Write a sequence for this structure.
């Protein structure tokens, strides 16, 4: 309200490509967490429920990052069989 | 290639399906190489003469009347 306008969340259109400008803006708001924050703010999440989800999300990220690391590590040996026939 | 039941008789043993495949995959890997005469008599022991009787039609003889 008290800030300058046309600086925050503002994307310029290139060569009249408004679809790409809108997608860029949508990607910015998504990465910064705004799109998902507006949605969660439509109805009140009860504090006990917010902690449960924030803890589930935190643990799914740790589990997915750890499962990706394991697959990458064990994919080094995906090469062809060096001792075929034995 | 010889069938699994024909390999199971050359060897006189019972074989799995995957056992048969591994042996065939190993023979194919041997043809792609520069196999010599000694390595060619061996592979032919496991190549059967497929009943490739041609689909070519048999022609009747041309006869002559009186």
């Amino acid at each position: 309200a008290k800030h300058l306008k046309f600086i925050a969340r503002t994307v310029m259109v290139q060569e009249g490509n408004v679809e790409s400008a809108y997608r860029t803006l949508n990607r910015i708001l998504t990465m910064d967490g705004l799109i998902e924050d507006i949605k969660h703010r439509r109805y009140y999440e009860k504090p006990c429920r917010r902690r449960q989800r924030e803890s589930y999300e935190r643990c799914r990220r740790i589990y997915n990052m750890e499962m990706a690391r394991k697959i990458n590590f064990l994919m080094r040996k995906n090469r062809a069989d060096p001792w075929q026939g034995c | 290639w010889l069938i699994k039941e024909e390999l199971e008789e050359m060897l006189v043993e019972k074989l799995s399906d995957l056992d048969y495949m591994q042996f065939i995959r190993l023979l194919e890997k041997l043809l792609t190489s520069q196999c010599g005469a000694a390595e060619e008599e061996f592979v032919q022991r496991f190549r059967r003469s497929v009943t490739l009787e041609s689909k070519k039609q048999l022609i009747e003889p041309v006869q002559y009347d009186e």
The interface with chain B takes residues 84-85 of chain A (CB under 8 Å).
